[PDB]
Amino acid sequence: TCPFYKKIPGTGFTVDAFQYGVVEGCTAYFLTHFHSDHYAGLSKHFTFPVYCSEITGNLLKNKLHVQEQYIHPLPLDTECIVNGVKVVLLDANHCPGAVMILFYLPNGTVILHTGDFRADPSMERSLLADQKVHMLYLDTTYCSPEYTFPSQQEVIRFAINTAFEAVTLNPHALVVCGTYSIGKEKVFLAIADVLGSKVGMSQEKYKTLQCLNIPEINSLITTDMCSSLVHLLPMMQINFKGLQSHLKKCGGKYNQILAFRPTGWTHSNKFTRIADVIPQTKGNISIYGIPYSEHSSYLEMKRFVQWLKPQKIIPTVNVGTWKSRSTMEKYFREWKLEAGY
Numbered sequence: 446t447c448p449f450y451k452k453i454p455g456t457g458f459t460v461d462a463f464q465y466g467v468v469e470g471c472t473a474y475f476l477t478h479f480h481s482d483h484y485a486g487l488s489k490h491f492t493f494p495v496y497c498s499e500i501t502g503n504l505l506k507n508k509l510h511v512q513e514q515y516i517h518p519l520p521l522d523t524e525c526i527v528n529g530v531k532v533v534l535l536d537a538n539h540c541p542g543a544v545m546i547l548f549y550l551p552n553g554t555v556i557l558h559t560g561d562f563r564a565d566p567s568m569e570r571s572l573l574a575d576q577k578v579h580m581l582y583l584d585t586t587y588c589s590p591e592y593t594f595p596s597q598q599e600v601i602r603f604a605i606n607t608a609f610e611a612v613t614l615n616p617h618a619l620v621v622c623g624t625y626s627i628g629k630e631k632v633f634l635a636i637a638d639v640l641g642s643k644v645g646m647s648q649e650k651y652k653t654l655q656c657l658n659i660p661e662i663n664s665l666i667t668t669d670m671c672s673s674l675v676h677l678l679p680m681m682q683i684n685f686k687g688l689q690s691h692l693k694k695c696g697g698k699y700n701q702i703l704a705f706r707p708t709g710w711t712h713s714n715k716f717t718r719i720a721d722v723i724p725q726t727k728g729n730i731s732i733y734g735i736p737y738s739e740h741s742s743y744l745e746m747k748r749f750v751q752w753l754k755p756q757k758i759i760p761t762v763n764v765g766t767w768k769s770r771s772t773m774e775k776y777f778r779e780w781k782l783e784a785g786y
């Protein structure tokens with residue numbers, strides 16, 4: 446049974462609600478992004494209208510085989526009428542194709558559903574500038590002040606400089622980058638660009654990347670692993686055993702691996718600057734954990750909410766414990782008292 450924080454009151458609409466069977470009263474199912482916790486339940490047998498971005502619709506058709514007649518892609522930044530209700534899709538600054546949804550309810554209430562997002566000051570000059578929001582359904586993944594991490598630009602600068610130094614010292618070093626979902630493509634694209642290489646990967650991952658509308662993608666990626674010195678592997682293989690095994694397969698082309706694990710936050714963020722990050726090393730293999738986040742930090746979330754001044758907040762993450770719910774409610778009241786709304 447579908448939980449309350451996935452229903453949009455006053456509509457026939459749900460958000461990210463495909464694992465509950467046929468939801469009573471639902472006439473249109475929105476999908477914010479192509480991450481498995483959110484699409485859980487969708488397949489080629491789905492026969493209700495799915496509303497989403499173009500990129501998400503490419504993934505639904507090619508990866509999950511949902512039939513074309515049920516996929517309803519909408520352009521971004523554009524007022525659209527769906528089943529008699531005005532909606533807008535906004536870029537969420539999460540993974541490719543990820544949106545926030547603005548719903549203009551028939552009674553005059555305005556609702557923002559962030560989906561998953563990484564708040565940014567640029568969102569203060571979107572279509573959100575123009576009107577008031579009564580209800581905010583908020584991605585609260587990192588809603589606590591201990592969750593700190595650098596900008597995505599600082600993280601990429603560290604990765605590019607680290608990879609370029611290692612391979613210039615040793616032209617026979619291979620770079621490997623872990624993946625388990627869409628998102629965080631800039632990690633491996635920026636490294637391959639500084640090295641003058643295409644990125645090599647499995648046929649299954651190539652297919653996924655081909656759905657993302659990335660400019661000049663055919664110039665950037667390949668399934669011919671032997672021609673490439675940046676390889677993508679499943680995240681589960683990014684350990685000394687999996688990497689050893691991979692280096693065997695390369696036919697003595699390489700004699701060293703430098704590997705990256707983009708994580709979200711880890712507690713080593715509580716002590717260490719990005720600049721001071723060091724790898725784990727065993728022989729000719731080194732592994733870096735890099736804090737590349739596609740979710741808001743505490744400070745970025747607080748800024749966004751203090752700007753938007755919603756009348757009510759409904760969290761969509763960390764909702765399963767009373768302690769998490771109480772913590773999040775305390776910070777919402779601080780923010781409101783401090784800013785005066």
Ligand code: NI
Binds near residue numbers: 478539561
């Ligand atoms: Ni996500």
